[PDB]
Structures are given as C-alpha cells and as structure tokens.
Write a protein that binds this DNA or RNA. Structure first.
Ligand SMILES: [Ca+2]
Ligand SMILES: [Mg+2]
Ligand SMILES: [Mg+2]
Length: 430
DNA sequence: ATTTTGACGCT
DNA sequence: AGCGTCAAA
C-alpha cells in the first residue's frame, strides 16, 4: 500500500536509429533514398550476407541474415550497398563514425549510455525537472509531441494511423495533472517533449531518423521504442504495464530472448510476462537464482533499477574474421598473415582512439576457433599490450596461440582455424 | 557459409 | 583469468 515502491522515480529514454547502416549509405548516395535497399557484407558467396534493410525492403520480406541472392528473389529491384573492405576484411569505420556523430548530438541534452553502435539510453530525470520549473504550471500542448504515441491509448467509448495517434495523445493530455511537479505521468510527458527535441536535433544535424521509447526504466524504454517504428516515439507509463504485459511474450523483454527466457517459459508453464506476477519472489529465486529471481519479480510489475551508466565510448576495440568451410587456415604463414591484417586494422583504430579520447588499452585478447568446435570461441588467451604496433601485436598473438597447433609438421596448422579475433581491452587514462 | 562486433555474469 | 550468455548493424 503506502510503502510499496512503484519504480516511478526516473525518466529514461532509449533512442534507436532506424535501419542505421542503410541510412548512412542513403545519406551518402541519394540514389538509394526512398528505395528498397539493403547493406551487404562481401559479395562472392551468394551475393553477400545482408546486415541492414530499409523499411521499404522489409515490406517484401527481406531480412537481416539473408543472403543477397535470396533477398533478390523476394525483391528483384532491391538496391544494395556494400560494406567497405580493407586488408581483406569488412571495415565498419563509416558506421562507427556516423554513430559518434549521433552520440555527440545526444550528449548535449543529457547523460547517455551507449548501448550499441546505433542505440543509446538517456537519463532524463534532471532535464525533466528543469523543464518543469521553466514551464511554470503551463499545460503541455499536443504540438510539442508531433510524433509521440501513448501506449494503451486511445481506449473506451477515425480509422487512419495518425488519427489514432492523436486521439490517444489527446486522451492522455486531457487527463494529465500538470499541477503536480512530482507526478510520474507528467514527468514522462515532459521527458517525451525533450526526446522530441533531441530527435529533431539529430535529424537536422545528421539527416538520420530514429525512434525512441520513454518510460521509467531501461527495459520499458527499450520495449517502448520498438512499439512504433520507424521515425516515432512511444511513451509507456507505469499504468500501461499490466495490460501491455498481459499479452507480451516473455522473449520480447531484454535479456529474456535466450535460454533463461526459454527456461522461464518451460519451468513455470507460462507464455506472457504478466503471468509472472502470480509467483512469490522466493519461488522465482528458487527456480532462477537470487539475482534473476528478484529481477523477474520486480520486472513483471514494470519495476527495474539498472542505472543508465555514464559511458559514451565502447569499453573494448576488436577485430575479427571468420574463415568458414574450406577457407579455414591450415598453414602457419596464413595464420600469421591474417594476424597481421587484424593487428593493422586494430592499430589504426587504437591510434585514432588514443588521439580522440585520451586513453590507452593495456591488454590484448586473442581468440580463435578450431574446425570442429561447437562453441563460438575454442580458445581465449590474453597478453600485455605495450605498444600500438601491428607487427608486435601480431607477433604476441601468434606467440600466445602457437601451442594450439596439434600438427607434428612445421608449416602446417591443425586443426585448421575457422576464426581469429583480436580485442584491445582494459583502457587507462593517458 | 550470416559476419562482425560489444557488454556483462559466473566461477 | 577464461568461459558463457545476450544483444547489435
Ligand atoms: Ca536500429
Ligand atoms: Mg538498435
Ligand atoms: Mg535490427
């Protein structure tokens, strides 16, 4: 009752660029704008593997992970842009730089947590309080929320999408109590006003469109973001949670898309997130462990406490290449040549990182997979990273993996290597 | 033969 | 420290 916390203390947004790599290529090549297009890596094997797809192409059924030849079967007029290749491998530099562009715009508004190359969480609590004192009890106009959906509305006693959006927003604003500065729904609404402004700034200054979720925690912000894509934002209030969760498959909640979510479904015999409310915390802890149990118990009620971490920069810098099927590396020289290629790209990125962000990596992680191994990594070993020098780094990696060669012969490597991975970690200020 | 990434938990 | 899980374009 009067003491049960409700997790309404923060305003958190999640901003996710729409079909990010496609928008990077469409900005660069206007011929691709407003067309079914996709971004592909490599070209030789089945036309390349698709990694990003415009909404126009998704309408034909084109997806990520599809081979371009197969996507062309679904969408004969599909346009393709190829990821740059350098030193024999895919090079993602253009997209990393466009991402930095967007994160720097977002950082002007608030503390952000970089969640991936194209997504960031935003803690808007303080900015919301400032906007609320500036507003001075003034009602919030629908005009300040031109692309906002209110999850769960309209409800109760037009057939076009934008009509429904405005009806729901009108119901929400009609209800709002702008008299109380501590009102969580008012705080979320002001959050949404700020996110509209941030999204406008991103589009004005980069050309890129994005979607956003606004709620009281990261999990609900992330779920909200996906409810109305592309180029829209969705507010998920605390009161919307019971109905939203009553038909929400467990796997849709972040961290439950894999084995743990599968076990929640199997062990408890449920399908939707709301059904979790019928278990005690101790029951959930018994099945899924103390940490997971407590998390599930609060989450199914819409409550989560994971903070938006102040981290705008990635914590590791890695380079990896697969050598699938018959291309697996079977000679010592091949292995050394590819270690050099990886180390040269890594050196270039590390040097740029040191100049831009005043830090230096101190550990080099080398990972390999051998033909036959079921796991993603067959071997992970670390060593000192003392100089941003590709020849030294490639030598150190070879030194640390050379004992993996079963082969009795000199020049041959067995079992053949199907993957190489170099990752610089453990950054220190410089 | 999705590939190339990046964060975080367990022990 | 090394391994596993979950997620991203
Ligand atoms: Ca995206
Ligand atoms: Mg995303
Ligand atoms: Mg995606």
């Amino acid at each position: 009752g009067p003491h049960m916390a409700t997790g309404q203390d923060r305003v958190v947004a999640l901003v996710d660029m729409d079909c990010f790599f496609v928008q990077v290529e469409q900005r660069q090549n206007p011929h691709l704008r407003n067309k079914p297009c996709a971004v592909v890596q490599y070209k030789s094997w089945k036309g390349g593997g698709i990694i990003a797809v415009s909404y126009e192409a998704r309408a034909f059924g084109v997806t990520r992970s599809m081979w371009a030849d197969d996507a062309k079967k679904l969408c004969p007029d599909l346009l393709l842009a190829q990821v740059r290749e350098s030193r024999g491998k895919a090079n993602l530099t253009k997209y990393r730089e466009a991402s930095v562009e967007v994160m720097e715009i977002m950082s002007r508004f608030a503390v952000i947590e970089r969640a991936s190359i194209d997504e960031a969480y935003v803690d808007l609590t303080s900015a919301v309080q400032e906007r609320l004192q500036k507003l001075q009890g003034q009602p919030i106009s629908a005009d300040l929320l031109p692309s906002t959906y209110i999850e769960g509305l309209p409800q109760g006693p037009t057939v076009q999408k934008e009509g429904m959006r405005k009806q729901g927003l009108f119901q929400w604003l009609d209800s709002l109590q702008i008299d109380n500065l501590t009102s969580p729904d008012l705080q979320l609404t002001v959050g949404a006003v700020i996110v509209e402004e941030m999204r406008a700034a991103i589009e004005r200054e980069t050309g890129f469109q994005c979607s956003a979720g606004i709620s009281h925690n990261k999990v609900l912000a992330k779920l909200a973001c996906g409810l109305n894509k592309p180029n829209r934002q969705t507010l998920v209030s605390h009161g919307s949670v019971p109905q939203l969760f009553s038909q929400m498959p467990i796997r849709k909640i972040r961290s439950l898309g894999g084995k743990l979510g599968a076990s929640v479904i199997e062990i408890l015999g449920i399908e939707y997130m709301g059904e979790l409310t019928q278990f005690t915390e101790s029951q959930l802890q018994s099945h899924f462990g103390e940490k997971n149990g407590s998390w599930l118990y609060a989450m199914c009620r819409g409550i989560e406490h994971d903070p938006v971490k102040p981290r705008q920069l990635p914590k590791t810098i890695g380079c990896s290449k697969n050598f699938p099927g018959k291309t697996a590396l079977a000679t010592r020289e091949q292995v050394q040549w590819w270690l050099l290629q990886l180390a040269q790209e890594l050196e270039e990125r590390l040097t740029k990182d040191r100049n831009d962000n005043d830090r230096v990596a101190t550990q080099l992680v080398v990972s390999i997979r051998v033909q036959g191994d079921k796991r993603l990594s067959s071997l992970r070993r670390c060593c000192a990273l003392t100089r941003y020098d590709a020849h030294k780094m490639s030598h150190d990696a070879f030194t640390v993996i050379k004992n993996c060669n079963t082969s009795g012969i000199q020049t041959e490597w067995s079992p053949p290597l199907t993957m190489l991975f170099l990752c610089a970690t453990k950054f220190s200020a410089s």
